């Protein structure tokens, strides 16, 4: 009965997603609708800026990509994936794409502004999270991956830098640059070094089990204060990941260690999330026995903390970044490549 309710939820959510996936929105705002305020954060492919919508006064977070740089870095298809997927999804813990558009030089994705900062900042400052607090965050990711995987979506960039804390203390996942809709296996070498599954490093084909491996890394880092595989250079990280060895802090509970060894299985055919019972092996594990999954989904569980808020447009929960102009050429660049954006 409870299980049937979940099946029905996912079936309807797939119907809703597929309508938008097959007929994406396009060209829903323009640049002069907004004033640009300051940079909130950066990634390998661009920057995200705080902007203010002139007519409404609402603040938003605008991701800006330079088309020529996307082409040079061979990220065309990945960027088309990001926008097509984001405009089609709807889940409590996924950031909302409000508008998208392009001009002669750049591509723009305007999201809801999530003011509480990256989980990363809070985690580094406090050192580590208690197990109850790590569990609160982890449950949101479990539900998010159940949703995404049911739509044939792999996420491929889980890390604290991409988990934003909202004004109710809940997570919003950002940056779908590596997200992809795939049935069966794929091969791209992508992600962040500390979070790569062995099968990615070893140039094997891989599937949604890489997201469950990354969940193991995330839970370990939240509860320990440091990742399970760390070094000064990526190559030394990769050697540790593939080794099959992992060491746990002495303070980790018995149930936490058991869950983490099941998520950090080097053989994907033995990894939790990828066995016959799928996500239910995780949701039914002893470490999650106190979790009320529907209450998490509905945002009714008390949060570990509420971020400080000093008014609309405040960015105190984010680092400062060097600012750079947004140039728009008089000539259209890369039109054919980005036709569908």
């Amino acid at each position: 009965s409870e299980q049937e309710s979940v099946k029905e939820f996912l079936a309807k959510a797939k119907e809703e997603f597929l309508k938008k996936w097959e007929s994406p929105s396009q060209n829903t705002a323009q640049l002069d609708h907004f004033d640009r305020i300051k940079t909130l954060g950066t990634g390998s492919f661009g920057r995200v800026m705080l902007v203010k919508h002139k007519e409404t006064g609402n603040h938003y977070a605008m991701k800006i990509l330079d088309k020529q740089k996307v082409v040079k870095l061979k990220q065309i298809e990945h960027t088309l994936n990001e926008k097509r997927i984001l405009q089609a999804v709807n889940f409590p813990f996924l950031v909302k794409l409000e508008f998208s558009f392009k001009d002669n030089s750049n591509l723009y994705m305007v999201m809801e502004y999530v003011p509480g900062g990256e989980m990363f900042s809070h985690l580094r400052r406090i050192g580590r999270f208690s197990e109850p607090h790590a569990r609160f965050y982890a449950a949101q990711i479990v539900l998010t991956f159940e949703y995404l995987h049911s739509l044939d979506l792999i996420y491929r960039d889980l890390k604290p830098e991409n988990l934003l804390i909202d004004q109710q203390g809940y997570i919003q996942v950002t940056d779908f640059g590596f997200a992809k809709r795939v049935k069966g296996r794929t091969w791209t070498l992508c992600g962040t070094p500390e979070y790569l599954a062995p099968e990615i490093i070893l140039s094997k084909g891989y599937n949604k089990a890489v997201d469950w491996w990354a969940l193991g890394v995330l839970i370990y880092e939240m509860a320990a204060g440091y990742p399970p595989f760390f070094a000064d250079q990526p190559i030394q990280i990769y050697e540790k990941i593939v080794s099959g060895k992992v060491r746990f802090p002495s303070h980790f509970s018995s149930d936490l260690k058991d869950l983490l060894r099941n998520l950090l299985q080097v053989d994907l055919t033995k990894r939790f999330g990828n066995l016959k019972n799928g996500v239910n092996d995780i949701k039914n594990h002893k470490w999650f026995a106190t979790t009320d999954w529907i209450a998490i989904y509905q945002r009714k569980v008390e949060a570990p903390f509420i971020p400080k808020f000093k008014g609309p447009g405040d960015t105190s929960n984010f680092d400062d970044y060097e600012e750079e102009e947004i140039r728009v050429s008089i000539n259209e660049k890369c039109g054919k490549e980005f036709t569908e954006f």
């Binding site: 990634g43 590596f178 250079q233």
Partner: peptide
């Protein structure tokens, strides 16, 4: 300690995708 070794390492700031 493992914590001290992490904090003295070069990868304690924001990490970029490969």
């Amino acid at each position: 300690t493992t914590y001290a070794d992490f904090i003295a390492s070069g990868r304690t700031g924001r990490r970029s995708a490969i």
